[PDB]
Design a binder for this molecule. Structure first.
Ligand SMILES: CC(=O)N[C@H]1[C@@H](OC[C@H](N)C(=O)O)O[C@H](CO)[C@H](O)[C@@H]1O[C@@H]1O[C@H](CO)[C@H](O)[C@H](O)[C@H]1O
Ligand SMILES: CC(=O)N[C@H]1[C@@H](OC[C@H](N)C(=O)O)O[C@H](CO)[C@H](O)[C@@H]1O[C@@H]1O[C@H](CO)[C@H](O)[C@H](O)[C@H]1O
Ligand SMILES: CC(=O)N[C@H]1[C@@H](OC[C@H](N)C(=O)O)O[C@H](CO)[C@H](O)[C@@H]1O[C@@H]1O[C@H](CO)[C@H](O)[C@H](O)[C@H]1O
Lengths: 146, 146
């Protein structure tokens, strides 16, 4: 089931992990360019959605406010999670927000092209990344409205 | 996670529900054109996959062997599950095969355009159709190669 409270197209938000409390950031310099962060609110943590239509109905591009790059999540090559210019040129720019099975208020950030979800954890490196496999709570996110 | 044993493109199979043991038929006359069935094997139970690429990577159109029509699954009008000619002209012709979280030998037939899964049950009417909501065992299917 698609998450029922997806931000209206163009509305700004942070993506905050339910369990760690960390937010995603997307910037253009200093690797890692997309990662999790546990600190003050900065503009590189702000995103909006481009709504997919046609073959991308129920998919969304995740665009960085300060730099205009959209997120990607791929299993092909490093960096596995990153950003790129455009409005969703590549199939791995398109995400589905899939509501959790037990927690109605959180969702997984799923990528159809790569069959992966994003996760945020405090344990093994890489502590932020994507993953193809079983459902874990560290895969659960909130939309934080600004 | 995508089912790891999706039949090669052009390989013929039936779609059998795990628990009911019923198969999907797709015929060209007499509503319902697509429904569940038990009894001897007939040609209109036979399907192949059209493999999606680019935006449709990891999706598939389910094409009837004898009549060439592809399945569709929608929520906008009756019939909800049906067939249409072509090779996946419309977005609701495209399905994802999502492995069960518990049973790695079965999968759900998921429709991205409508956010539905196909189900086969002996209990309440309608006994076959599509569904948006919790994961139940009556939503699990097998590829039965012929
Ligand atoms: C100051 C600094 O270099 N911080 C980086 C650090 O974060 C570690 C903290 N203990 C934390 O709370 O996470 O490592 C991470 C990668 O895990 C980042 O690179 C941090 O760089 C700060 O990131 C924010 C993101 O909102 C901004 O880009 C800041 O400009 C950047 O310094
Ligand atoms: C596009 C390409 O040739 N490959 C990668 C390259 O980017 C080169 C462009 N000319 C450019 O962006 O300047 O390096 C970047 C670094 O982040 C990417 O990995 C490119 O990979 C392409 O990335 C997209 C991201 O959405 C997809 O993974 C594509 O499949 C991949 O080819
Ligand atoms: C379980 C394990 O060996 N750890 C990590 C591993 O292996 C996973 C499979 N080989 C796979 O499908 O990739 O490598 C990946 C790197 O992508 C993960 O870090 C695995 O850790 C698992 O990650 C999930 C993320 O949601 C959870 O943190 C699990 O607790 C963790 O075991």
């Amino acid at each position: 089931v698609n998450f029922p409270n997806i931000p209206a197209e163009g509305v700004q938000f942070r993506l905050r992990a339910r369990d760690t409390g960390y937010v995603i950031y997307s910037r253009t310099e200093n690797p890692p360019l997309v990662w999790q962060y546990n600190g003050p609110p900065y503009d590189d943590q702000l995103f909006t959605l481009i709504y997919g239509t046609g073959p991308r109905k129920n998919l969304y591009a995740i665009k960085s406010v300060p730099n205009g790059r959209v997120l990607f999540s791929r299993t092909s090559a490093s960096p596995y999670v990153g950003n790129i210019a455009g409005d969703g040129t590549y199939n791995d720019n398109w995400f589905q927000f899939i509501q959790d099975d037990n927690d109605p208020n959180s969702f997984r950030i799923y990528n159809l092209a790569s069959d992966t979800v994003l996760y945020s954890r405090t344990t093994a490196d890489p502590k932020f990344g994507n993953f193809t496999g079983a459902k874990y709570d560290d895969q659960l996110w909130h939309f934080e409205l600004v």
